[PDB]
Structure formats: structure tokens, C-alpha cells
Amino acid sequence: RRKGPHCERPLTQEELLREAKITEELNLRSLETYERLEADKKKQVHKKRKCP
């Protein structure tokens, strides 16, 4: 009785939707440019000093 088929939302791909998804992937390439550029590693300072 406790069935869970998940046949709902039977989504399918189409040619008009193809170019839209290509468009968001072109934007994803543009975003990839932010991965193609680079910044620095942020190194760290020395340990605290004793004083007895």
C-alpha cells in the first residue's frame, strides 16, 4: 500500500528549450572566467611569543 512511484513531473527535453539551456551554459562559461582568473593564497603569521 505504501507506494512511491514518483511518476509525477515527467520532464522532457525539446529543441526550443535546447537553445535556452545553451544560453544559461554560455552564461556559465562567462562565470567560468571568474575561475580562470586568480588571486592569492593568504599565508599566515608566526606563533605567539613567550615572555617569562
Partner: protein, 68 residues
């Protein structure tokens, strides 16, 4: 079969002819070795085959690339 699809920075001669050969193999339902010697952009030829098949043979399927 010698035609670039939604791709950028287009091929040079042997790469375009290789794209043509690859989609010719696909159309005849064949499987192939692109045994091109190194530097002929066989990666780029394969990417162009990906694009060509995606736009011209229905839609793209999940091509799996297993590499070193």
C-alpha cells in the same frame, strides 16, 4: 558532415576533416579509434563531434569520457 555546430574558435583543416570522419562513423553506426598523432587536437575533434551530434541527431546524451 563537414560543418561546425555551436562551437567557438573553429577547427583547422585536419581537425575539420576528422570531425567529418567521426560523424560519418556515427551515421553508419560504427565505432572508431581516432589514432591521430599527438597535438592534432583529437580532444578538440571529439568535442566538435559532441557538438555536431548534439545539434544534428536529436539531442545530446550523457557522453562519458574516461581519461588518465
Amino acid at each position: 558532415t563537414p560543418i561546425p555546430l555551436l562551437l567557438r574558435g573553429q577547427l583547422r583543416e585536419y581537425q575539420h576533416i576528422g570531425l567529418d570522419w567521426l560523424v560519418t562513423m556515427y551515421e553508419k553506426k560504427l565505432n572508431g579509434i581516432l589514432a591521430d598523432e599527438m597535438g592534432l587536437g583529437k580532444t578538440i575533434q571529439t568535442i566538435s563531434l559532441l557538438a555536431h551530434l548534439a545539434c544534428e541527431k536529436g539531442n545530446w546524451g550523457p557522453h562519458l569520457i574516461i581519461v588518465p
